[PDB]
Amino acid sequence: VNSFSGYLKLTDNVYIKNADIVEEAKKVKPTVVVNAANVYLKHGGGVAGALNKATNNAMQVESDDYIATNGPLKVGGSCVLSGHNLAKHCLHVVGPNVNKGEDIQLLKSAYENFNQHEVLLAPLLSAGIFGADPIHSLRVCVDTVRTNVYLAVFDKNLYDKLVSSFL
Numbered sequence: 001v002n003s004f005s006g007y008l009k010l011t012d013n014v015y016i017k018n019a020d021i022v023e024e025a026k027k028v029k030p031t032v033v034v035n036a037a038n039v040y041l042k043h044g045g046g047v048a049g050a051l052n053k054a055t056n057n058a059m060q061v062e063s064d065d066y067i068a069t070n071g072p073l074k075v076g077g078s079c080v081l082s083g084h085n086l087a088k089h090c091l092h093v094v095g096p097n098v099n100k101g102e103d104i105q106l107l108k109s110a111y112e113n114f115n116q117h118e119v120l121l122a123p124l125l126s127a128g129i130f131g132a133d134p135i136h137s138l139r140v141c142v143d144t145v146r147t148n149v150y151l152a153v154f155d156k157n158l159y160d161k162l163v164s165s166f167l
């Protein structure tokens with residue numbers, strides 16, 4: 001038993017809800033919140049900008065120190081950093097950005113990072129300003145992640161289409 005509330009159960013291990021990940025994170029304090037990161041951990045907009053703003057820019061300060069030491073992530077890769085006031089940990093995961101021409105096949109590799117964590121609150125990778133089809137992203141998530149994933153979908157209209165077209 002865990003503290004996630006109001007989710008619709010899609011499969012044995014995937015759950016979905018219409019929620020603002022920032023507000024869901026502040027209420028659950030999950031062990032892991034996933035950020036839709038870029039390779040530079042520049043958290044300017046989308047989910048990343050919203051998560052970082054919620055931390056009062058502490059996420060960005062920590063991220064800049066990480067990059068200065070380690071260099072950029074790989075597309076499809078991840079790193080674990082602090083969850084600040086939102087979660088124990090933040091798993092920064094880089095899905096391919098279609099608006100940069102990155103291969104969408106890397107979306108499966110991105111979701112594989114979730115399997116290193118027993119339970120996660122997460123957005124749909126490569127959705128939103130990353131330009132991929134959120135329905136494809138949900139399909140890859142379901143077919144790749146084996147651990148327990150609670151997906152937060154900000155847009156109510158999108159969620160309803162996601163739930164309604166799910167196979």
Ligand SMILES: Fc1ccc2c(c1)[nH]c1ncnc(N3CCO[C@@H](c4nnn[nH]4)C3)c12
Pocket residue numbers: 019020021022036045046047048049050123124126127128129130152153154155
């Ligand atoms: F201010 C915001 C902006 C975006 C989100 C937010 C608060 N909260 C969210 N909770 C879940 N999913 C989200 N998004 C929505 C747009 O499409 C995807 C994306 N994520 N990053 N770029 N695009 C996923 C958001």
